[PDB]
Write a protein that binds this DNA or RNA. Structure first.
Lengths: 246, 77, 135, 91, 112
RNA sequence: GAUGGGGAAGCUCCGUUUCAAAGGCCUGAUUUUAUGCAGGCCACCAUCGAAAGGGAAUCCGGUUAAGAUUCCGGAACCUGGAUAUGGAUUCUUCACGGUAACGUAACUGAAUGUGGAGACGUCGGCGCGAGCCCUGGGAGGAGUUAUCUUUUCUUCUUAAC
RNA sequence: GCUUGUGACGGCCCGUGAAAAUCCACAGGAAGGAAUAGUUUUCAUGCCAGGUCGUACUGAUAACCGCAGCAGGUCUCCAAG
RNA sequence: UCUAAGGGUCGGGUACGAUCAACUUAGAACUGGUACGGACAAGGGGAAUCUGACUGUCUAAUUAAAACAUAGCAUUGCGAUGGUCAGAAAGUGAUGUUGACGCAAU
């Protein structure tokens, strides 16, 4: 047979990311003395649009502790920040939108975003627009914290893991019908070559497992085992249930 | 490609020791509306530039020509 | 009451001197033939003396501490009036409208101002007025 | 002169796309092209430059916000929840 | 009804390749290549083009006197003079109130 | 796409600042002699990759059997380097004027840091320019005239700097 | 009026539409220097050098590619009544 | 062959006059072998049915379609010690300069 279309994204030739207009990797600040023993203040210089992403970025400019200069970094902008805002970062900072605190330093029921999985990864969870995690509880001994991931999963992380207060800007984005194949063309030119999607039904027995036949139909179950093997996997993969919800 | 206005400043460049040659151009024009007159230009050649003086009143232009330095080798018209 | 007066220190916020400190010497509150606005004659220091330290001896101290003054008519709107003060009675005669108009009288009138300021920087009265504002 | 009746701003789309989708966009595109008060300068200059970013042309503040509107729904209850937890610990 | 060519081997209409049409002394129209225009220098603060500076291309400032490239305020060829007016206000009144804060920290010692 | 490394029986593959002891500067200290010893620094750490992108600076006239923004004549300009003259400044050692926007022939400035330029989509009308088009008075040359036609055509041009 | 350049405005986007060399300014104050006289080549003028390879001609109903002196194919500027 | 309407520059002690210059529209008499967008240039229209919503794409050299695509709809795996894929190996790589309003598979 042939090598199918999803097996063909691994070698990553024309499928790589379209990286040109991107302002940079949006991260939080390296974890250092000043931030874990106290706070350090920047100001947000301009909040700007990043290509390929859905949410704006902010550029806050800190002062390097050990050398005379400025250093400016790329934060995914929480909703409500504004240029000219002081952004405080560190253990002793205060609870306000945009300030990055450790999670142990905030009461339960606090709404933070761009939170870290492990301390010093410079952010992981809830970076898409409109997302947030809630802090639902603490474990002050063998220090952990109980947070609610934007999907609704409940994860338990370290209490030295930082996160920035508030909701990520760009909420409401998918409320608007996209309305034409052109606007979906301008969406994925800045992301990657995924589009448009030929139904595996509509291709030949070589192109796909769903291909062939004098009618268009799958012919065998569209749910595939998690223990399937490379290229067998197309369709709903290792689903526990299927079909419209009620 | 420059112009001089004061007569005196022109007398300087002629001695400025970079000037080997000069010239005198005569142009017949007219002024105001009605009547003509005889206009002359003095073009001294620097190394990097060419200076000119314009004399529209011929009562001055003659007293100037005699005043040129003797070393300067002048090509008239 | 009127806090713009003969001793009142100010900051120069408009032009070539912006950021430098002055002292309001002869204010005209309202009116003049030229300057149809409230203005104040001032004196200030254009160069600030450099950091002097324990380690500098001999001639460096005299050449670090050199002051360069100025005298200027200025509009109130271009001044920040502040709470500080100077004892100005030294040069009250030497900084005047008559000093302007005859610009020779202006470089004659910087000397009596330059001398009064490098005095005070010895005997550290008015420590602040001699320290560079920074911005 | 109101011109059109129902379609309003979506008259640009003509007859295409189906009535619901055209009506559901008319909901948002009246929000993103609308002009809002400015929480700083006290005028209404605020307009959208892009998804997420809202620019004052008066006080030149830029303000992050919702994609199709200034203040998202679930946001205005975060800055109250954050205002409440702040006072909880300091009171 | 005359028509004219490029004077260079670039056939294409790109950003550097602009043409202006010139009447020579010898009576003929001829094309003249023109260099890209100069942008005014900007305030690094407010972004508004800061007046008093001559607008040239970048390497054409190496040839110019310093009075074209500057004004005689502090932060002369850099900030727009209303961005200098503020940062003097802000430097004075921030380190003004900052003295009042340090007496209260001497009083809060003796008051408690 | 080398290097350091890491796989691979191997041809070679990964990767491009990566688990690296990855480097040469600014002048002070020298008036035995030139550069030892000196403090400080700066950590971006190959190279390749566009005759359409970025970019230091040249124009007119003439010239050949065939070459010219290259040759000729003239008028400019940029860059790298050397120093000499005039002016300016200096006794208030490192300029003055204007309320200010800012002005000017000049008018000290290392490490370091920051800001601007380079530097940017598209469409729509509006304004202002340049060449072209049309066109009246006047100075010339050509074509028509059996009759009419103050007539029809053509030359009156102005480069970089 | 037509062609091209430009400036100020407006529209559009879940699309906001390159990088670098290079050059300049500013902040700072290292140092270095007036009085029997000391600087400054970012003011003027003057002085010297400016290398290597390309440069002809077609660019197409016969100079390119299609076995060819082929009705095919091939990017671009100027544009009269 | 006429009539009408539409602009400008200009002097007024603290209503009018003059001159210059446009291609636009509407109206009226007359006129002729009823001809007049005189050549050129330049939609045929209507009442229904099957079928794909539309723009768009494809078998270069027998098929341009009702086929592929699309917006919209829904389902599915995945919280990184991960989902989907690559490599002969690897101190290895694509999504990923990513983080569920995301990526991947239908």
């Amino acid at each position: 047979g042939r090598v199918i279309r999803n097996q063909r994204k691994g070698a990553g030739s024309i499928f790589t990311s379209h990286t040109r207009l991107r302002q940079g990797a949006a991260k939080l600040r390296t974890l250092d003395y000043a931030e874990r023993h106290g706070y350090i203040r920047g100001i947000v210089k301009q909040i700007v649009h990043d290509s390929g992403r859905g949410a704006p970025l902010a550029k806050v400019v800190f002062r390097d502790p050990y050398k005379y200069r400025l250093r400016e970094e790329i934060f995914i902008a929480n909703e409500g920040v504004h240029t000219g805002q002081f952004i405080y970062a560190g253990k002793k900072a205060s609870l306000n939108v945009g300030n990055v605190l450790p999670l142990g330093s905030v009461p339960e029921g606090t709404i933070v975003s761009n939170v870290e999985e492990k301390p010093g990864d410079r952010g992981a969870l809830a970076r898409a627009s409109g997302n947030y995690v809630i802090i639902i509880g603490h474990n002050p001994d063998e220090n952990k914290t109980r947070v609610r991931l934007p999907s609704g999963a409940k994860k338990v992380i370290s209490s030295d893991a930082r996160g920035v207060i508030g909701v990520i800007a760009g909420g409401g984005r998918v409320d608007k019908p996209l309305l034409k194949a052109g606007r979906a063309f301008h969406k994925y030119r800045l992301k990657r070559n995924s589009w448009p999607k030929t139904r595996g039904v509509a291709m030949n027995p070589v192109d796909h497992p769903h291909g062939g036949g004098n009618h268009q139909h799958i012919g065998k179950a569209s749910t595939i085992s998690r223990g399937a093997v490379s290229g067998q996997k197309a369709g709903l993969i290792a689903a526990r249930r299927t079909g419209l919800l009620r | 490609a420059r112009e001089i206005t004061d007569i005196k400043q022109f007398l300087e460049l002629t001695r400025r020791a970079d000037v080997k040659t000069a010239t005198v151009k005569i142009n017949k024009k007219l002024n105001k509306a009605g009547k003509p007159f005889r206009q002359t230009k003095f073009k001294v050649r620097g190394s990097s530039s060419l200076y000119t003086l314009v004399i529209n009143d011929a009562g001055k232009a003659k007293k100037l020509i005699q005043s040129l330095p003797p070393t300067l080798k002048v090509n008239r018209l | 009451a009127k806090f713009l007066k003969a001793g009142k220190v100010a900051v120069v916020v408009r032009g070539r001197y912006a950021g430098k400190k002055v002292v309001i010497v002869k204010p005209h509150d309202e009116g003049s033939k030229s300057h149809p606005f409230g203005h104040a004659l001032v004196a200030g220091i254009e160069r600030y003396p450099l950091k002097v330290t324990k380690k500098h001896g001999a001639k460096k101290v005299a050449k670090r501490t050199k002051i360069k003054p100025f005298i200027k008519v200025v509009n109130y709107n271009h001044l920040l009036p502040t709470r500080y003060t100077l004892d100005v009675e030294a040069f009250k005669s030497v900084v005047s409208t008559e000093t302007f108009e005859q610009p020779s009288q202006r470089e004659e009138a910087k000397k009596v101002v330059k001398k009064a300021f490098e005095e005070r920087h010895q005997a550290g009265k008015n420590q602040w007025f001699f320290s560079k504002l920074r911005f | 002169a109101k011109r059109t009746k129902k379609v309003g701003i979506t008259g640009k789309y003509g007859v295409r796309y189906g009535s619901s989708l055209r009506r559901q966009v008319k909901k948002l595109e009246i929000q993103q092209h609308a002009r809002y008060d400015c929480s700083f300068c006290g005028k209404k200059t605020v307009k959208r430059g892009a998804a997420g970013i809202w620019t004052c042309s008066c006080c030149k503040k830029t303000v992050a916000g919702g994609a199709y509107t200034v203040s998202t729904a679930a946001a205005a209850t975060v800055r109250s929840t954050i205002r409440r937890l702040r006072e909880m610990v300091e009171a | 009804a005359q028509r004219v060519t490029f004077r260079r081997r670039n056939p294409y209409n790109t950003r550097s390749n602009k043409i202006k049409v010139v009447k020579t002394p010898g009576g003929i129209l001829r094309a003249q290549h023109v260099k890209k225009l100069a942008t005014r220098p900007k305030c690094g603060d407010c972004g508004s083009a800061l007046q008093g500076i001559s607008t040239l291309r970048p390497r054409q400032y190496a040839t110019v006197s310093k009075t074209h490239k500057t004004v005689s305020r502090a932060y002369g060829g850099s900030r727009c003079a209303n961005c200098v007016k503020e940062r003097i206000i802000r430097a004075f009144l921030i380190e003004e109130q900052k003295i009042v804060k340090k007496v209260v920290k001497e009083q809060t010692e003796a008051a408690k």
